[PDB]
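Tokens for chain A. Residues wanted.
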């Protein structure tokens, strides 16, 4: 005797049609959709299509490679601008790698089938990749597949799940507590707790550690290192920022979600600047992705989503929509069409297509500030469009007194590359380079010319 098992996945001819943009959901954790991506790729190769797979993070890329073992898959790093074999190959890369190559190479191939995993990712480079992709689709040049449970425009915080979820609304501490939340530490399962910031996570995680819980923390910069540890069975809590909304799978029974995030905002009252507004309520899609960490396994029916407060769907002041346009306006096509945002995302910005386009040296500086300097899109756009060269770091010290960077109420002071001690005082202020200490550590390194 034998068990039926997941049946072979027959591919809908429609998904390979030019001008077709398919939205699907892999429904992970029920052991029913293992063969989908491998079937799509094998069928794509059968049709002799030039295929691109976009993963949101390196971790997911690596998981896909294992899932696709035996198929002719070639992982592409952002350290390489283009990689053309003579052979039948599927390119695999990060959302951000695709966008970066579109910005620094005239050799990006004419993929006619593009699969974007976790296509809800609202990182600017991801938003930009989606515009480019859907532009190519509308031109009849490609077919695309956006895989995600919360496609752009979705507004449902309590979508379908593989297994039932108990949605529980109760007060959740935003800072360390010492009494009154016994349900948090009495629970005997594993928990994923979404915090609005690393700082909040630090407080929560240290409180939990004082009770003896084993806690793995996750943020954007530690994710590639720390997430693999969560795949070990030795923890009580994962404390994570919203980086874990993009394909992070956890063998957990409970999510705790105060539904708070920080949002970068371009302030235009006075000198343009970017602050990290908040903590403010998440969008409904983000609440759905957080909750969607659990209720994945239909044999485990008592998973819990513990949440507080309601989502806010209006996020049109998010800096990412403008930053997406800064990237898109700088991607050119032979057709010379400037790509536009994916349709559900067009309403997020009133910017006129092309208004951020840059020319010549400025364009490569822009690209280099982001790639090699690791600066936010907004900040990189300001530096490059002022005519500054990648290497020229004077602007990090010539800002107004208000732009003085503090750490612990101490004025940051560093060594220029040339050997002078100067107050860190950037001409343009983007809170993403100074709010988090490790981000400040990287920005100092940049200002000092070691980058
Ligand atoms: Cl983060």
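Reply:
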């Amino acid at each position: 005797g034998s068990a039926m098992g997941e049946p072979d996945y027959e591919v809908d001819e429609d998904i390979f049609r030019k001008k077709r943009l398919t939205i699907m959901d892999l429904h992970p954790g029920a052991g029913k959709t293992k063969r989908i991506l491998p079937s799509i790729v094998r069928e794509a190769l059968k049709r002799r299509l030039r295929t691109l797979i976009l993963a949101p993070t390196r971790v997911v890329a690596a998981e896909m490679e294992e899932a696709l073992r035996g198929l002719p898959i070639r992982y592409q790093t952002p350290a390489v601008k283009s990689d053309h074999t003579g052979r039948e190959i599927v390119d695999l890369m990060c959302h951000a790698t695709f966008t970066t190559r579109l910005l620094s190479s005239t050799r990006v191939p004419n993929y006619n089938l593009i699969v974007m995993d976790e296509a809800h990712f609202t990182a600017p480079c991801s938003v930009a990749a989606r515009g480019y992709i859907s532009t190519r689709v509308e031109m009849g040049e490609a077919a695309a597949i956006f895989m995600t449970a919360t496609p752009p425009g979705s507004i449902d915080p309590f979508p379908q799940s593989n297994s039932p979820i108990e949605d529980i609304e109760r007060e959740i501490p935003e800072r360390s507590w010492n009494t009154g939340f016994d349900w948090i530490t009495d629970y005997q399962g594993k928990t994923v707790w979404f915090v609005p910031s690393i700082k909040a996570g630090n407080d929560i995680a240290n409180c939990l550690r004082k009770s003896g819980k084993r806690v793995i923390q996750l943020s954007r910069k530690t994710f590639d290192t720390e997430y693999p540890k969560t795949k070990l069975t030795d923890w009580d809590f994962v404390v994570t920022t919203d980086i874990s909304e993009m394909g992070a799978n956890f063998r957990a029974g409970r999510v705790i979600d105060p539904r708070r995030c920080l949002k970068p905002v371009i302030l235009t009252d006075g000198p343009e600047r970017v602050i990290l507004a908040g903590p403010i309520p998440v969008t409904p899609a983000s609440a759905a992705q957080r909750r969607g960490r659990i209720g994945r396994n239909p044999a485990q029916e008592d998973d819990q989503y513990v949440f507080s407060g309601d989502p806010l769907k209006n996020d049109e002041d998010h800096a990412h929509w403008t930053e997406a346009k800064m990237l898109l306006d700088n991607i050119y096509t032979p057709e010379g069409i400037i790509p536009t945002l994916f349709g559900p995302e067009r309403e997020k910005t009133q910017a006129i297509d092309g208004e951020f386009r840059l020319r010549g040296e400025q364009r490569k500086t822009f690209v280099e500030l982001m790639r090699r300097g690791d600066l936010p899109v907004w900040l990189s756009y300001k530096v490059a469009s002022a005519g500054i060269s990648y290497k020229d770091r004077e602007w990090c010290f010539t800002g107004e007194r208000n732009n003085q960077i503090l750490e612990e109420n101490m004025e940051v002071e560093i060594w220029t590359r040339e050997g002078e001690k100067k107050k860190l005082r950037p001409k343009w202020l983007d809170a993403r380079v100074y709010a988090d200490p490790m981000a400040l550590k990287d920005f100092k390194e940049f200002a000092s010319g070691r980058k």
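The chain has twelve helices and 18 strands. The chain has three domains: 1-154+315-352, 155-314, 353-451.
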